[PDB]
Amino acid sequence: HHHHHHLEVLFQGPHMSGVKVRREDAKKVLELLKSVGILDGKRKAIRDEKYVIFPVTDTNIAKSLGLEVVDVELPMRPERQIYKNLEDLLPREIFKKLGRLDIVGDIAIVSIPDEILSEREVIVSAIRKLYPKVKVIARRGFHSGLYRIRELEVIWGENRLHTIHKENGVLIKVDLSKVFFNPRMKGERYRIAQLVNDGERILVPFAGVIPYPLVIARFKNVEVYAVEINEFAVKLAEENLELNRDRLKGKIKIIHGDVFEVLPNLPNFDRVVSPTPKGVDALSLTLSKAEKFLHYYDFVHESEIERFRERVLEECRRQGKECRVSVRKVSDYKPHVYKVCADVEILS
Template structure:
């Protein structure tokens, strides 16, 4: 069976690319060989065109329980087609699964728990998720199966992130965004991260790049988890993280400007003018915008740049859907030289 041979440091991005193209063979395990990794791929003529070394090797099949199955196909055994339509996306954070259960599936909770455990046999907790509440964006959860805790260690992009969903915000779906930013950043940059939470962005960036990061968070419990996370990943981080407990609107005005600012802005908070005023070169500003308002959002950023007398280019990228027609977006703002 075919496999592509790639240097170890490229294995993760190449695997992502192969998955995106539908060429990765998830039924077999990859294998490490010295400084290389052999990634299993399906037989497809497109592989040759990708420019990787292709080998024919016997990579072992994953045990059946590890093969990715989706919840919907597993639950098709127990739920009607009508009921399946109400099934929502869920997240796995460390050994905790969190799922939203609409009223239409209230009577199916036991089946959903059964299905999730079948798809993810390592789970220790299954929680039902409510909505984000308050300034700290903490969700309201109720545990519907397993151990009575919402604390776990989540692995992502080569770092370990201790989270406690009852105390601090964490969104595993931003994994790709964090990786994207880590790739954009250059060694030597000074990076400012307001609204830093338990430090997922800072850790992933410091894992890959030799940079100096200053992060700010107001929620005391998120701040303490963040400090633990710096310790937890200590040996692996190339960059340095300074973590400040405080209110962004009080702390930022006292700080110097930084090469790059990353603002995972909480919904409903406007920190655009403040973060832009602390940016020397690049700002990545997250916000929630209706699809019909994206151009206006872009124009607003350009107007803020103009007010500061800076020449900017702005690219707005949809990051995830939030509710019908409303997206979480990231504005990548580049400030041109003086």
């Protein structure tokens, strides 16, 4: 005959019990159950208004932990994964308070207000499920300093904020701990790239790690001057120029400097593209460098859009330019605030 401690593992059926705990104890108990090693990963936990039931693999150990054992038929864990949005994976009360989620390379960046920080672990879980390939999850603060670096804290995965982001056929090395970069601008950067004609000389102030010059030069044989004050951003921009050298039709000239110092010393350009830092007014200067087109990005309250257009026109007249000015909503920034672009066509 066999030893009992050998036979005890032979039962072929599924586990059919769980523990019933008060919701206020749930997290505690979950931890306990994992630590003791009797948490059944094959079934879902469930809840009602007062209680949670966790599936367990050993009801005797469970009783030895002082937990109420119940016999229930619990849902099997999903094998297939049809979720497509974050909201599919989170309670609405938690999802609604999350900020925008961004993917940069293999880094996920999300805003988590203090009052749902307590739900961090489910949030991470959700993100990891929605994006199996991300290696880093960072919580988003706000921008700081002249270089407009975003406050970020790694809350899951590798302890790093550098990656290579793919966009519009180019490779963009970023280090989010040292530079500003917005993946959401992909569309814009494609759009302008299509608008540009071969033979143009183009100026991009506030160029960052030059994603705009890169996309433009990717699709058009043009010369692009890029001006950026952040030397870390400049470094990464040089590395990006090298990384994409074989797939660019156009040429890019990187200038490390202060836009407001550099631009008055430059010749003028066919087209100027100004991804202006939020709150900075560079309209006069950037327009002053444009001969045919200006694309001037700004952030404007929806009650101020018309005023914004009026002010652009005013500056056009002040510089003695005859212009067509078109304002586009580029994205929803805050409630009642838009990231906008003034397309200025200078008439001849």
